[PDB]
């Protein structure tokens, strides 16, 4: 079946180095936990709160071996009063047999409270 | 097959109570009209126009029994001049064998003009 | 499987005619490259950079023959420093078993740089 996998991390500052590292990690933990092979990934959406402008998060995807063909695009997360700042969110769509309740959704850094 | 189900509604005021209630009521109608069960939902994206800041509309999914594992995320709608103000829209991706031309899309409140 | 197909194009004026024409053109190119049938399309997302406001680009989909049931929604792209201005990007989800590395993504106008 096809199921979404969610993740979220935070950056300390709006630099390219930080954003690509926090995203790359978030992506490795998702892969680890859910055994995602790049070819089972339908598409990925990455969003970032309105305070992040230094690089597209999508750039870290093509720093993973075998991931250069997975289609990824980015969106601006809505601005909510009191929402977690400098937060990058991923919604990955994958072909999996794993049941809905057993998907490992990943929250790292300041996102551990989402 | 897996198909997308669209919906839209509007709130009168940017208030958490108004946003969660009008969103819950739209999700309930989509679900009703299409006999959707939580385990068949791949994922769900909810958008809000740039004038709504009180709460993330995804907080309303919390009040639908059984939906606790359905992965949902939000995005900001683009700002079009003359677009419907105070509008929440949904794209729900479900596993279904209903023909494309028979998916029931739901437009409520002022969004009935879309 | 179901696979995402990415596209991107740019406009010269933020105007209804130019955003509708360049988006129609992007979509007609994706369909011809991927030999897409509307019944096989799960859904589609279109994002626009923060400088485009004249019309939603989703409106170009009703100019395509037979696409009146395809569920589409828009979203706002994040504003990246050094990013492509006046850019319209699409993520189309389709049912297909063409392997991932053989999907044809389309980059028109100033997006040929990608």
UniProtKB/Swiss-Prot annotation, chains A, B, C:
**Binding positions for prephenate?**
6, 73-77, 89, 107
Q: Does the keyword Amino-acid biosynthesis apply?
A: yes
Question: Which top EC class applies here?
Answer: isomerase
Intracellular or extracellular location(s): Cytoplasm
**Highest taxon of the lineage:** Bacteria
Broad class of the protein's primary localization: cytoplasm
Keyword Iron appears in the UniProt entry: no
Keywords per UniProt: Amino-acid biosynthesis, Aromatic amino acid biosynthesis, Cytoplasm, Isomerase
Q: Which CDD domains match?
A: AroH
Could you say what the effect of mutating residue 77 to A is?
A: No chorismate mutase activity
- The EC number(s) this enzyme carries: 5.4.99.5
State which pathway it belongs to.
Metabolic intermediate biosynthesis; prephenate biosynthesis; prephenate from chorismate: step 1/1
User: GO MF terms on file?
Assistant: chorismate mutase activity
- A Pfam family (short name) is CM_1
Annotated Chorismate mutase aroH-type domain residues: 2-114
Its recorded reaction(s) are:
chorismate = prephenate
* Any GO BP annotation: chorismate metabolic process
GO CC aspect terms: cytoplasm
Q: Which NCBIfam families match?
A: CM_mono_aroH
Q: What does the record note on quaternary structure?
A: Homotrimer.
Role of this protein: Catalyzes the Claisen rearrangement of chorismate to prephenate. Probably involved in the aromatic amino acid biosynthesis.
Spell out the note in the miscellaneous section: This enzyme is monofunctional, and its activity is unaffected by the end-product aromatic amino acids.
Q: What is this protein called?
A: Chorismate mutase AroH
What organism does the UniProt record list as the source?
Bacillus subtilis (strain 168)
Gene encoding it?
A: aroH
């Amino acid at each position: 079946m096809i199921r979404g996998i969610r993740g979220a991390t935070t950056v300390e500052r709006d630099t390219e180095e930080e954003i690509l590292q926090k995203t790359k990690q978030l992506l490795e933990k998702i892969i680890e936990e859910n055994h995602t092979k790049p070819e089972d990934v339908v598409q990925m959406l990455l969003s970032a709160t309105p305070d992040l402008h230094a690089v597209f998060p999508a750039k870290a995807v093509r720093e993973l071996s075998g991931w250069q063909y997975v289609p990824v695009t980015c969106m601006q997360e809505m601005d909510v009063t009191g929402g977690l700042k400098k937060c990058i969110r991923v919604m990955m769509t994958v072909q999996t047999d794993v049941p809905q309740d057993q998907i490992r959704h990943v929250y790292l850094e300041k996102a551990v409270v989402l």
